[PDB]
Design an enzyme around this catalytic site. Structure first.
Site, PDB file in Angstrom:
ATOM      1  N   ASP A 260      37.397  49.213  45.972  1.00 23.34           N
ATOM      2  CA  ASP A 260      37.904  49.912  47.071  1.00 23.34           C
ATOM      3  C   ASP A 260      39.536  50.714  46.409  1.00 23.34           C
ATOM      4  O   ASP A 260      39.885  51.314  46.816  1.00 23.34           O
ATOM      5  CB  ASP A 260      38.026  48.506  48.692  1.00 23.34           C
TER       6      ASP A 260
ATOM      7  N   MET B  13      37.532  44.137  58.807  1.00 26.48           N
ATOM      8  CA  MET B  13      37.570  42.932  58.153  1.00 26.48           C
ATOM      9  C   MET B  13      38.353  41.793  58.183  1.00 26.48           C
ATOM     10  O   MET B  13      39.691  41.960  57.468  1.00 26.48           O
ATOM     11  CB  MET B  13      36.108  42.383  57.546  1.00 26.48           C
ATOM     12  N   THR B  14      38.736  41.020  59.104  1.00 32.02           N
ATOM     13  CA  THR B  14      39.644  39.751  58.883  1.00 32.02           C
ATOM     14  C   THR B  14      38.839  38.828  57.890  1.00 32.02           C
ATOM     15  O   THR B  14      37.297  38.348  57.446  1.00 32.02           O
ATOM     16  CB  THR B  14      39.807  38.725  60.272  1.00 32.02           C
TER      17      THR B  14
ATOM     18  N   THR C 258      36.547  52.165  31.141  1.00 33.61           N
ATOM     19  CA  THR C 258      38.596  52.450  31.634  1.00 33.61           C
ATOM     20  C   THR C 258      38.714  51.106  29.970  1.00 33.61           C
ATOM     21  O   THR C 258      38.023  50.447  29.195  1.00 33.61           O
ATOM     22  CB  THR C 258      38.565  51.166  32.546  1.00 33.61           C
TER      23      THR C 258
HETATM   24  N1  LIG Z   1      36.645  43.819  34.310  1.00 38.60           N
HETATM   25  C1  LIG Z   1      37.220  45.106  34.453  1.00 38.60           C
HETATM   26  N2  LIG Z   1      37.912  46.165  34.133  1.00 38.60           N
HETATM   27  C2  LIG Z   1      38.439  47.084  34.353  1.00 38.60           C
HETATM   28  N3  LIG Z   1      38.114  47.649  35.381  1.00 38.60           N
HETATM   29  C3  LIG Z   1      37.296  47.145  36.134  1.00 38.60           C
HETATM   30  C4  LIG Z   1      36.827  45.993  35.751  1.00 38.60           C
HETATM   31  N4  LIG Z   1      35.796  45.967  36.762  1.00 38.60           N
HETATM   32  C5  LIG Z   1      35.819  46.647  37.357  1.00 38.60           C
HETATM   33  N5  LIG Z   1      37.045  47.918  36.879  1.00 38.60           N
HETATM   34  C6  LIG Z   1      37.367  49.346  37.702  1.00 38.60           C
HETATM   35  O1  LIG Z   1      36.700  49.013  38.835  1.00 38.60           O
HETATM   36  C7  LIG Z   1      36.374  50.169  39.340  1.00 38.60           C
HETATM   37  C8  LIG Z   1      35.891  49.722  40.759  1.00 38.60           C
HETATM   38  O2  LIG Z   1      34.123  48.779  39.713  1.00 38.60           O
HETATM   39  P1  LIG Z   1      32.628  48.546  40.783  1.00 38.60           P
HETATM   40  O3  LIG Z   1      32.978  49.105  42.020  1.00 38.60           O
HETATM   41  O4  LIG Z   1      32.220  47.708  39.370  1.00 38.60           O
HETATM   42  O5  LIG Z   1      33.786  47.852  41.579  1.00 38.60           O
HETATM   43  P2  LIG Z   1      33.318  46.462  42.847  1.00 38.60           P
HETATM   44  O6  LIG Z   1      34.506  46.129  43.462  1.00 38.60           O
HETATM   45  O7  LIG Z   1      31.789  46.981  42.917  1.00 38.60           O
HETATM   46  C9  LIG Z   1      33.478  44.842  41.224  1.00 38.60           C
HETATM   47  P3  LIG Z   1      32.820  44.401  39.810  1.00 38.60           P
HETATM   48  O8  LIG Z   1      33.014  45.446  39.185  1.00 38.60           O
HETATM   49  O9  LIG Z   1      32.900  43.052  39.494  1.00 38.60           O
HETATM   50  O10 LIG Z   1      31.280  44.259  40.766  1.00 38.60           O
HETATM   51  C10 LIG Z   1      35.344  50.616  37.849  1.00 38.60           C
HETATM   52  O11 LIG Z   1      35.190  51.940  37.835  1.00 38.60           O
HETATM   53  C11 LIG Z   1      36.993  50.164  37.128  1.00 38.60           C
HETATM   54  O12 LIG Z   1      37.638  51.418  36.714  1.00 38.60           O
HETATM   55 NA    NA Z   2      32.393  49.205  46.423  1.00 42.18          NA
END
Ligand SMILES: Nc1ncnc2c1ncn2[C@@H]1O[C@H](COP(=O)(O)OP(=O)(O)CP(=O)(O)O)[C@@H](O)[C@H]1O
Ligand code: NA
Ligand SMILES: Nc1ncnc2c1ncn2[C@@H]1O[C@H](COP(=O)(O)OP(=O)(O)CP(=O)(O)O)[C@@H](O)[C@H]1O
Ligand code: NA
Ligand code: NA
Ligand code: NA
Lengths: 314, 312
Positions: free
Chosen positions: B255, B11-12, B242
């Site tokens: 991702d 996706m762009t 983490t």
């Molecule tokens: N604030 C944070 N600190 C450290 N690691 C984080 C983090 N937010 C996400 N991660 C890392 O990214 C992984 C994927 O997080 P998640 O699936 O919740 O991401 P997302 O792409 O949905 C963005 P968000 O978590 O803000 O809604 C977590 O399991 C953790 O390893």
């Molecule tokens: Na996701």
């Protein structure tokens, strides 16, 4: 030689069609995306070129795919690109547009490269500006650059057509005094004057406030009510109505109007203002009968011959 | 030879940065526009490739400038484009994104050419899929194509990693039974299970529902709280934290995590799941400390040596 020189904006339109408009924090799906060409300056230049004007667009776009594609859009409309500059330092200006099935929208404009059109670019365009019949500008580039273009045009005796769009409440006074023709819409006139502008009557009061700031001619466009005009020599307002049509999409009608007026100022100078405005209204009302901003602007070959008569026409 | 095959979306991303989000009928002005490269499939593929995976992206874009630029983005990240198709019949998929200064956003996705990736396009990739270690899919293309990809992978004994994102409540049951590793976030688990998921404990409850629907391993990511994992063989939920970092932009963290997991499943098959998940949490947490999406995904050369050691 380009008889109409537009110093102003180009914007890539990035349009997503959805069934509903999204709110804060929402992700939604739409069913179609497409790219179109906009910007008030380019829109005005397009309309004048399609009426038969020899035009040149003084503008800046990114050194990017959108910028290259914009250049090609100008070329396809027979506009000179001799002063279409590019920059590594900003992206082409954009309008990101989300539209629902009723045609309501959310628009986010990023001026981008349009704001980097600068003094040195104007100096390179000095000869083209000076040799024109009409120089058209708006407020979608740096206001100081618009002012420099007006200044250069006035020093050369070139007619200045200024479109304060989008408006700013407190413009440099020289915007007025350097404008031979000052053309704005109802909402703009509200911002400039602090008055309500809903009706032709209201537009006559607003227009006089603007005239008294030093414009030679003031024109307020009024949608389906046509326009109202005043001038230093004839300060009583004249309301120039447009015949009723079935509007499909009014977007860009103002730019159609202004581009048509620039054409007539450059190519039919003999005509009265009233006759120029009658014809400009007609052309703009043609544009409202079709979708798609620049794609709706009519060509000379598609228009009635009476719009191109050299003399006053009943 | 590709060890990681991703069948999924490109996706762009057309991004405008503003001070305020617009309401209906409003025109606002923002301060920056840029184009970025997104799509869950491509994002996962880029992360795995940056770690050193030999990857192949099976996808469809437009025969348009966006599509050509997407192909060059995949090539720049050393990803095979053998089965990156282009079509005249739809434009490259787009996400028009508006982001305010507090990071709140409006997103309009037009999937476009992604939807036209078909079973014939996927059948052509049969030899590459059969020689892979891991196949990764998401929910951003047409369901029938992703189900067929998971079917192919199973026939060849290729590990399947399924990310049910974005989630849909009435998910085809085959997405559970065809997934060797099923990875989703909290909000996705809520959608799939009807349970509220607001702690690691809640996540373990939701994961167990997913397990009983036929998954082999279920992983729920939990943002800053890391992730929770359960499996058929070890059904007790394990919370894997983490370390606290200062997040700059968490977009695309999920991702990064999935892509890292794909890398480890393909290249470090002897590590325990728990060790893979620690490493994948670390890599995703790196991604959150940089702006953007794909541009935030770290390269192997920039990461701690310990993340590439053959053992725990
Ligand atoms: N604030 C944070 N600190 C450290 N690691 C984080 C983090 N937010 C996400 N991660 C890392 O990214 C992984 C994927 O997080 P998640 O699936 O919740 O991401 P997302 O792409 O949905 C963005 P968000 O978590 O803000 O809604 C977590 O399991 C953790 O390893
Ligand atoms: Na996701
Ligand atoms: N509904 C209508 N029917 C006929 N002519 C119309 C019209 N709407 C606009 N016009 C013509 O277009 C000219 C410009 O109108 P105005 O400046 O109000 O348009 P605009 O560009 O602000 C519309 P939008 O807000 O949708 O872009 C008018 O003076 C008139 O000649
Ligand atoms: Na206008
Ligand atoms: Na129109
Ligand atoms: Na990031």
């Amino acid at each position: 030689v380009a008889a109409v020189v537009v110093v102003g904006s180009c914007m890539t339109d990035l349009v997503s069609l959805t069934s509903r408009l999204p709110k804060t924090g929402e992700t939604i799906h739409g069913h179609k995306f497409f790219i179109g060409f906009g910007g008030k300056g380019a829109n005005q230049c397009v309309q004048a070129a399609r009426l038969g004007a020899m035009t040149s667009m003084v503008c800046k776009v990114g050194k990017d795919s959108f910028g290259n594609d914009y250049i090609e859009n100008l070329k396809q409309n027979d506009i000179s690109t001799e002063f279409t500059y590019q920059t590594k330092d900003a992206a082409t200006g954009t309008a990101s547009i989300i539209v629902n099935n009723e045609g309501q929208n959310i628009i986010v404009i990023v001026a981008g490269a349009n704001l980097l059109l600068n003094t040195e670019d104007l100096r390179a365009a000095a000869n083209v500006i000076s040799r024109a019949k009409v120089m058209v500008c708006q407020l979608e580039i740096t206001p100081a650059t618009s002012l420099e273009a007006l200044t250069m045009a006035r020093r050369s005796g070139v007619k200045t057509l200024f479109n304060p769009a989008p408006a700013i409440a407190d413009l440099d006074p020289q915007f007025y005094t350097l404008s031979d023709v000052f053309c704005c819409n109802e909402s703009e006139a509200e911002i400039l004057t602090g008055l309500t502008v809903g009706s032709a009557a209201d537009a006559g009061e607003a227009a006089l406030v603007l005239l008294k700031r030093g414009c030679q001619v003031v024109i307020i466009t009024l949608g389906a009510e046509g326009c109202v005009v005043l001038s230093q020599t004839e300060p009583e307002p004249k309301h120039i109505p447009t015949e009723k049509v079935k509007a499909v999409d009014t977007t860009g009608a103002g730019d159609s109007f202004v581009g048509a007026l620039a054409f007539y100022l450059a190519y039919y100078p003999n005509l009265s203002l009233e006759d120029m405005l009658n014809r400009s209204n007609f052309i703009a009302a043609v544009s409202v009968q079709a979708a798609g901003t620049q794609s709706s602007y009519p060509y000379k070959k598609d228009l009635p011959l009476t719009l191109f008569l050299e003399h006053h026409h009943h």
